[PDB]
Amino acid sequence: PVPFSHCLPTEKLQRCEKIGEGVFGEVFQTIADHTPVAIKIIAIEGPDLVNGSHQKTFEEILPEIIISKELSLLSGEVCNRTEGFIGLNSVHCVQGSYPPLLLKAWDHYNSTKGSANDRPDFFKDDQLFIVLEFEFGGIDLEQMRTKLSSLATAKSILHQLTASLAVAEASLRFEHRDLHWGNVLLKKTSLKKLHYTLNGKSSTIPSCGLQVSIIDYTLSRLERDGIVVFCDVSMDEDLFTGDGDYQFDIYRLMKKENNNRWGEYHPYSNVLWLHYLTDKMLKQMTFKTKCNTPAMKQIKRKIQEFHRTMLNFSSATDLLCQHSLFK
Numbered sequence: 507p508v509p510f511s512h513c514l515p516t517e518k519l520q521r522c523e524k525i526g527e528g529v530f531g532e533v534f535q536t537i538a539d540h541t542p543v544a545i546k547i548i549a550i551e552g553p554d555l556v557n558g559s560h561q562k563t564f565e566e567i568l569p570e571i572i573i574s575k576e577l578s579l580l581s582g583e584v585c586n587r588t589e590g591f592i593g594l595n596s597v598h599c600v601q602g603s604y605p606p607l608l609l610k611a612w613d614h615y616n617s618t619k620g621s622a623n624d625r626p627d628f629f630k631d632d633q634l635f636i637v638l639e640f641e642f643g644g645i646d647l648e649q650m651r652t653k654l655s656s657l658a659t660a661k662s663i664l665h666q667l668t669a670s671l672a673v674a675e676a677s678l679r680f681e682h683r684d685l686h687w688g689n690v691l692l693k694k695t696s697l698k699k700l701h702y703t704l705n706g707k708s709s710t711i712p713s714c715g716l717q718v719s720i721i722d723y724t725l726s727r728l729e730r731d732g733i734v735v736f737c738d739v740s741m742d743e744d745l746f747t748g749d750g751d752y753q754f755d756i757y758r759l760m761k762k763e764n765n766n767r768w769g770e771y772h773p774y775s776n777v778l779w780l781h782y783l784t785d786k787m788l789k790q791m792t793f794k795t796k797c798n799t800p801a802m803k804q805i806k807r808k809i810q811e812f813h814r815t816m817l818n819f820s821s822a823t824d825l826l827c828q829h830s831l832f833k
């Protein structure tokens with residue numbers, strides 16, 4: 507293990523601002539070489555509860571690390587290529603107490619946005635963490651609930667998500683398994699079209715001025731050469747007992763689909779998540795401009811039609827290749 511200062515030299519540490527959180531830990535934004543990055547920091551191996559849950563062991567955190575790498579690498583592949591997952595810059599195992607400058611950032615977020623986490627000031631100098639440094643992906647879909655232009659943007663978002671998931675299905679038999687709207691990131695792009703390749707066939711997607719990145723592989727699954735990497739949630743109580751959002755039904759529906767056998771490949775889970783996201787787009791998102799032109803009213807009708815038909819597709823690949831929305 508390395509000290510925090512290895513990952514976060516002084517100027518980089520000074521520029522850290524907290525941008526997100528979960529039971530897992532903390533996410534900070536900073537900058538190096540003029541380029542923003544997101545730093546995900548997860549305590550591991552220790553006995554303390556953190557945000558009410560036990561810390562993962564090294565063995566338990568490895569799947570997320572491996573999957574983050576494999577998905578990042580899709581941006582440079584040939585037959586199955588997508589930039590729709592987040593870039594991974596580095597992963598380190600760090601040892602130390604939590605840096606005071608990160609506690610200062612933590613406090614600022616707590617004062618302005620409020621936090622559901624414990625202030626991370628109780629770790630000793632032997633504490634281990636995993637620090638994952640990612641590309642900065644923009645703002646999550648949930649925080650953009652009231653910020654998008656029109657449902658035309660929603661179409662581009664769904665098309666990008668479907669294409670990324672398809673390429674990952676084809677390359678890695680990938681299932682995301684936790685693609686709630688906190689895990690769909692949006693960034694401005696000056697590209698008019700985005701490019702992907704699926705089983706050696708290249709295509710494009712109109713960007714509507716946004717690039718989508720999918721994040722957070724804590725519950726994800728994939729395989730290479732029959733070696734499966736996944737999170738076995740077969741004995742988890744709480745994951746399947748959520749209420750108040752269609753998100754929590756997706757966990758249940760995934761368990762129905764796979765008969766509680768999480769090592770298996772069931773790409774229908776990607777379809778379930780895409781259905782949940784389509785549902786968010788039609789029910790919870792609110793757009794600055796409503797559908798007023800005939801072209802835009804046809805877009806709304808097509809997204810509604812996608813919502814009511816997509817559950818009859820077997821995978822994100824089947825949706826991309828066969829759904830009328832993407833013709």
Ligand SMILES: Nc1ncnc2c1c(I)cn2[C@@H]1O[C@H](CO)[C@@H](O)[C@H]1O
Nearest residue numbers: 526527533544640642643644646688
């Ligand atoms: N790479 C990134 N770029 C930008 N924001 C990021 C990330 C990552 I990793 C996470 N987040 C933000 O933190 C929240 C919790 O994962 C997410 O919901 C999101 O708001």
